[PDB]
Design a protein around this ligand. Structure first.
Ligand SMILES: *[C@@H]1O[C@H](CO)[C@@H](O[C@@H]2O[C@H](CO)[C@@H](O)[C@H](O)[C@H]2NC(C)=O)[C@H](O)[C@H]1NC(C)=O
Ligand SMILES: *[C@@H]1O[C@H](CO)[C@@H](O[C@@H]2O[C@H](CO)[C@@H](O)[C@H](O)[C@H]2NC(C)=O)[C@H](O)[C@H]1NC(C)=O
Ligand SMILES: *[C@@H]1O[C@H](CO)[C@@H](O[C@@H]2O[C@H](CO)[C@@H](O)[C@H](O)[C@H]2NC(C)=O)[C@H](O)[C@H]1NC(C)=O
Ligand SMILES: *[C@@H]1O[C@H](CO)[C@@H](O[C@@H]2O[C@H](CO)[C@@H](O)[C@H](O)[C@H]2NC(C)=O)[C@H](O)[C@H]1NC(C)=O
Ligand SMILES: Cc1ccsc1C(=CCCN1CCC[C@@H](C(=O)O)C1)c1sccc1C
Ligand SMILES: Cc1ccsc1C(=CCCN1CCC[C@@H](C(=O)O)C1)c1sccc1C
Ligand SMILES: *[C@@H]1O[C@H](CO)[C@@H](O)[C@H](O)[C@H]1NC(C)=O
Ligand SMILES: *[C@@H]1O[C@H](CO)[C@@H](O)[C@H](O)[C@H]1NC(C)=O
Lengths: 572, 143, 572, 96
């Protein structure tokens, strides 16, 4: 009934609201929508349902499951645990930033609404006419991003703090263990959508919103050529659904061994996709409004400059007749017109739209823009930040449940060590290793931990899992279309996507990705470049390549270690 | 009464500004209505009986003709037309610049196009009658 | 626990907030609080708890109680029923007015905030200059009160139809019978107070509110001389507690015959008095603010007239130095000053405060005043009107439950008629008879039905009840320190009121009332007098005296009829 | 730019009003600073180079002395003092 849907609504997280719109903007919008759907029907659904069924039938933890299948397949759970840990360290910083924004959302007038004046007290800061108030607030007030990764500064004060306070909040939420509930889930699931309706309304009431929707819906050809969009979409859907983490399996174990796991899988996948699409609508409406406003300002500045230069009657020079007046003035006085020609700019709606605001913190710099033009900004700001905080807290609770479980069985240490001490030690260790994201150039490291060589091993985990399933242990000797699992999913053609196309699909985009990786031989990270106000591309240093290679190798060589461990048994 | 605080002291320069504004209003009236060109000046606005309450009588004459006095009705019409432009010059709001014979009135406020009370009561009475009918029918069905 | 207190909160009603502040204002304020305290500490408790005990022990309706005590004593329940029905007819009109105000509270800008312009469209209506916007709205827009009671007009359209709507709402609430609940009652008891905090804050944050507090607190000497204050306070407390209506007895009969009724009575009286005092504070704060504003306006107008006449420098003539400037100007130009004197007015703060707004609808013309300077008027206006509506609905539900029960036992008529049809017929008949309060002069009839000689037969009913208890059948043969009353609080000193001083208390002020009635031999009712804008006094017509006399007689002569009705059967 | 709509046409009367306001500002400056009484008039404010953009150059001289020109710095100071009072005379907001 309704309680089932309210419980399954815990599938929503920060991979649907904070990360999906950022990726959608990154890869042209419409050209990113269609692959996702193709990667939704054929990839997430079969793997998710197969996992869930395996977890339900196994009735034990993932590590024990791997041992039961074969000593050869042992160790994958360790890689999953390491992946979850690496996700958590850089995941908590989002909650830290949300806490920072909520704390600063109490002043009046709100920041990021007006701009600090210059040292002369006569005009505004040059950075503001370069980059808007929200962009300046996010890039200098709360991050103080260095011009380049090579430049470094001391560890900052406010971020480390927000991170510490958030980490102690997470530790308290772990210690209380008040996860079991059946009445508040209605409210925790209703808050996100009801909050989003207000912002949808405001976005629809703002001028120029239609252009953003057209940009997000209409696909492009150039963006579709690159395979990096495909691999990033696959990583996005994997991260949102949560394959390879080893947490779903663990869930299954508690779940009663009588339920249509296919029904659960479809009901969660559809909800996730619908929520992501709705959030993308809400965000891109305001993004289109901002782009339209910037285009109008671009036109206004040029119009005013021309009017002042040639002393034309005010209001006479409109946007519609701009080209005709430009040509007529060029014809009339070619000399000084050609002289001041370098001062003219051309307002290009399309190039301004595709590149208006970019980067990881898009969702932070868009909704705040939608906040500064509200009747009571503080109210909706507080509701939005509290919703983000609660969603991040729930996701962090899930991640902590994932990480803690393997360490629970360690009786050798737990005989004289309480679980609270172990949880606290893990929390402080993760917080200390995550201090790097609070330092002046730490944002680049965060993008590295989010995009480049980040959660890429997840596809390898999925591949080895489905390879193990495709062996004699699947549909041949074990789980051979047995009637025990409620008599459903017995040799259906559905088996095909997790026995046919998908295992090939794991390597289909991998070869394309590695082809361009070596053919192009180039890789660029975006930087702020406060001197102009627009992000610029820079080349990764050698040590960055070394560290990301070590990071991917750390999750890669786990399987050969198990192979070497079991080789002595194999030989004799 | 109008400013309360920050009120500037009334010196001769304020009288000069007032006379110039009056001459400007007279010029506007004689240009945009009677289609004539008259060059009024501040010396053609005679004033008398100055009081600390900032109260004084005044009248307007021809550009250079002492024995020519502009009749009062045309001056009243000019003031009626240019009162809005005169008021903001001295930061007044038509409550502290009464002319003793010219009362302001422009714009009858008629906001309600639908008589919201009627339609609201209509929807409530419809819902209450449908509720009472469905309830009595259910009661009869329940014997 | 807290559920008992939340259930017991139901004792609050539309007499503590609607009617108490009007009476407090009418009789000087401070001079009215102490008789209320005396009447509560000597009269409310003994009668209330004695009733409750009678209802608990008798286990049956009031009629059956009268049969148990004495066949002669029959008819008291019939008189109480008639009194309740008489109360109900004019009671429902308050709900009608609340509906009217709630419906009109949706327009912007709100009414009673600006005044209609004159037919010249050059100024405001002179009536608004005389009587403020709220008074104009309540006397001409929604009532159109005739200049005198003798003059009458045709029935109006809005009040009649609104009264019909309220009556069908009451009928639906009766028919549904979904009164039994245990969880929403918390919300219904918490809403009034939390609503009142906002208005208390706004009243206390406004200038001049403290003057209302001194006025309503500080008692006087001359006001205490009048005896009508005592009878009015007794009637008010009787109406608020509701004793004598036959509804309590019922309730008490409903509950299990083992409970400490004395604690229930004291906890009811304490909360009733506290709520009444709180509401009086909230109302009188705004009333004092309004009086202070009117006094300031009087001073400003006088100052402006003097400045215009004598051409004094603006700002030089202040409120403090008014007398010195008046004397100096009288010295300077005695002739014209003396000529102008009659045109001069003089502000009077005290006379203004004690007589600023008066009449029945005080609570309507005060809070609406407070509404006109809200941050967001519509919100709090809707909340307050909804609270008034729900309190009126609850009170109506009561006194109905009171009226229906004695007619429910009439099996002789109910054999061929269902109870729903009888209830509907009663509701329609009461609605039809309540139509007499919807003409241009119906307001005077309503004040007669509510204030002047209204529900005075309640006093004689209580007197008859207590003298019946004081006889040999009480505390001598029956209720003679029996164990049946839970063995606690048995024959304590509280008898010294309910068997002692209280009866005399009933006649002690009755004799004063009847002495003043014959000594003065004159009764005055308030008229609007729109020609000036202030209420005046006028004399009642003869037929008004006749109708009020027959009204009190209708409830007075019941017992003598029963005496003969029993004696005729006793003869044979 | 400022009014958007309902903008009054700029005729000679507006120029006369502007010149009178400038003379008033100069009188205020010379009275409240230098404690001198100078009776400036609207004919003491010379204007030149009138443009359709409502742009022109102007300067101020002695009451009746053509060969005397007020230095630019003092005029700038007077305009600085009286800009707020000039602005609302034409309903402008210091940006137009
Ligand atoms: C966009 O604005 C630039 C302004 O530089 C224009 O670029 C000019 O290109 C023309 C030839 O097409 C040259 O003759 C000029 O020297 C350039 N402008 C300069 C540097 O003054 C251009 O007209 C606009 N359009 C594009 C596509 O660039
Ligand atoms: C100044 O105004 C007076 C009033 O109009 C003018 O005097 C009139 O002159 C005309 C002929 O020019 C006569 O017909 C009128 O009888 C005169 N007075 C009246 C009653 O109008 C006078 O001409 C104007 N000009 C000068 C220089 O004085
Ligand atoms: C205002 O000034 C005084 C104060 O009320 C009033 O003068 C009174 O005149 C009456 C009639 O002769 C005398 O009986 C009183 O003795 C005078 N003073 C007092 C104490 O009232 C005067 O009437 C007032 N003007 C009004 C009310 O219009
Ligand atoms: C008008 O202004 C000029 C210059 O301001 C005055 O000339 C001054 O007096 C003599 C005349 O040759 C010169 O030597 C001075 O240099 C002039 N002063 C300055 C500052 O230039 C002239 O006197 C003024 N005439 C009147 C009637 O005021
Ligand atoms: C989908 C599903 C179905 C049954 S559970 C479950 C959840 C897994 C994905 C949720 N998160 C996984 C990590 C990222 C996080 C985020 O980006 O916000 C979302 C889990 S796993 C343990 C608890 C829950 C609710
Ligand atoms: C005090 C009390 C104690 C137990 S009950 C009860 C109530 C009697 C007085 C309430 N009203 C009585 C009529 C007027 C009305 C009003 O002026 O608003 C208040 C009753 S009697 C039947 C139900 C209830 C709650
Ligand atoms: C503002 O102040 C800075 C620092 O002294 C200076 O370099 C610059 O010229 C000033 N700009 C102005 C006067 O607007
Ligand atoms: C309004 O009514 C008429 C029409 O203007 C007018 O003669 C009368 O003096 C005015 N009186 C007022 C102000 O009511």
């Amino acid at each position: 009934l309704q309680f089932v849907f309210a419980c399954t609504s815990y599938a929503v997280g920060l991979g649907n609201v904070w990360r999906f719109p950022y990726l959608c903007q990154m890869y042209g919008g419409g050209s990113f929508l269609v692959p996702y759907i193709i990667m939704l029907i054929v990839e997430g659904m079969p793997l998710l349902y197969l996992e869930l069924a395996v977890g339900q039938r196994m009735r034990q933890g993932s590590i024990g499951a791997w041992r039961t299948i074969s000593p050869y397949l042992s160790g994958v759970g360790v890689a999953s645990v390491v992946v979850s840990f690496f996700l958590s360290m850089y995941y908590n910083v989002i909650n830290a930033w949300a806490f920072w924004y909520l704390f600063h959302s109490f002043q009046d007038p709100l920041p990021w609404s007006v701009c600090p004046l210059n040292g002369n007290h006569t005009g505004y800061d040059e950075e503001c006419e370069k980059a808007s108030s929200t962009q300046y607030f996010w890039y200098r007030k709360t991050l103080n991003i260095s011009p380049s990764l090579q430049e470094n500064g001391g560890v900052q004060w406010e971020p480390a703090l927000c991170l510490l306070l958030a980490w102690l909040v997470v530790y308290l939420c772990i210690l209380r263990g008040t996860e079991s509930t059946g009445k508040v889930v209605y409210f925790t699931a209703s808050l996100p959508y009801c909050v989003l309706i207000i912002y949808l309304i405001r976005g629809l009431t703002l001028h120029g919103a239609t252009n953003g929707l057209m940009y997000m819906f209409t696909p492009k050809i150039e963006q579709l050529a690159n395979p990096k969009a495909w691999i990033n979409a696959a990583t996005q859907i994997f991260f949102s659904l949560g394959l390879g983490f080893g947490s779903l399996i663990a869930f299954a174990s508690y779940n009663e061994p009588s339920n249509n796991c296919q029904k659960h899988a479809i009901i969660v996948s559809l909800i996730n996709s619908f929520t992501s699409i709705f959030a993308s609508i809400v965000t891109f409406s305001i993004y289109g409004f901002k782009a339209t406003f910037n285009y109008e300002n671009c036109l206004k500045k040029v119009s005013l400059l021309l009017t002042n230069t040639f002393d034309l009657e005010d209001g006479f020079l409109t946007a519609s007749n701009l080209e005709q007046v430009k040509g007529y003035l060029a014809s009339a006085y070619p000399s000084k017109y050609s002289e001041m020609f370098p001062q003219i700019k051309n307002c290009s709606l399309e190039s301004e739209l595709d590149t208006a605001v970019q980067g990881t913190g898009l969702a932070f710099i868009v909704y705040t823009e939608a906040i500064k033009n509200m009747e009571v900004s503080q109210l909706w700001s507080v509701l939005y930040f509290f919703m983000l905080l609660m969603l991040g807290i729930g996701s962090m609770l899930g991640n902590t449940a994932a990480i803690l479980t393997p360490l629970t069985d360690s009786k050798i240490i737990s005989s004289h060590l309480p679980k609270e001490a172990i949880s606290g030690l893990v929390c402080l260790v993760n917080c200390a290793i995550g201090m790097v994201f609070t330092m002046e150039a730490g944002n680049y490291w965060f993008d590295i931990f989010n995009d480049y060589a980040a959660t890429l091993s997840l596809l390898l985990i999925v591949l080895v899992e489905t390879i193990a399933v495709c062996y004699v242990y699947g549909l041949r000797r074990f789980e051979s279309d047995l009637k025990a699992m409620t008599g459903r999913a017995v040799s259906w053609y559905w088996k095909v996507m997790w026995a046919g196309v998908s295992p090939l699909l794991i390597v289909s985009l991998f070869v394309f990705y590695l082809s361009d990786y070596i053919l192009t031989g180039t890789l660029k990270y975006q930087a702020w470049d406060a001197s102009q106000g627009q992000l610029v591309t820079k080349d990764y240093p050698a040590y960055a390549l070394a560290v990301i290679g070590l990071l991917v190798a750390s999750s890669t060589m786990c399987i050969p270690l198990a192979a070497l461990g079991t080789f002595v048994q194999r030989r004799l | 009464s109008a400013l309360g605080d920050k009120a500037y002291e009334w010196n001769d320069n304020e009288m000069y500004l007032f006379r110039s504004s009056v001459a400007y209003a007279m010029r506007q009236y004689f240009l945009k209505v009677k289609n004539q060109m008259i060059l009024f000046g501040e010396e053609d606005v005679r004033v008398a009986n100055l009081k600390p309450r900032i109260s004084f009588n005044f009248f307007v004459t021809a550009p250079k003709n002492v024995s020519d006095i502009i009749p009062r009705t045309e001056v009243e019409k000019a003031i009626r037309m240019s009162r809005s432009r005169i008021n903001d010059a001295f930061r007044l709001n038509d409550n502290s610049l009464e002319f003793l014979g010219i009362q302001p009135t422009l714009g009858p406020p008629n906001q309600p196009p639908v008589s919201i009370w009627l339609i609201v009561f209509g929807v409530v009475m419809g819902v209450i009658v449908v509720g009472i009918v469905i309830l009595i029918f259910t009661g009869i069905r329940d014997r």
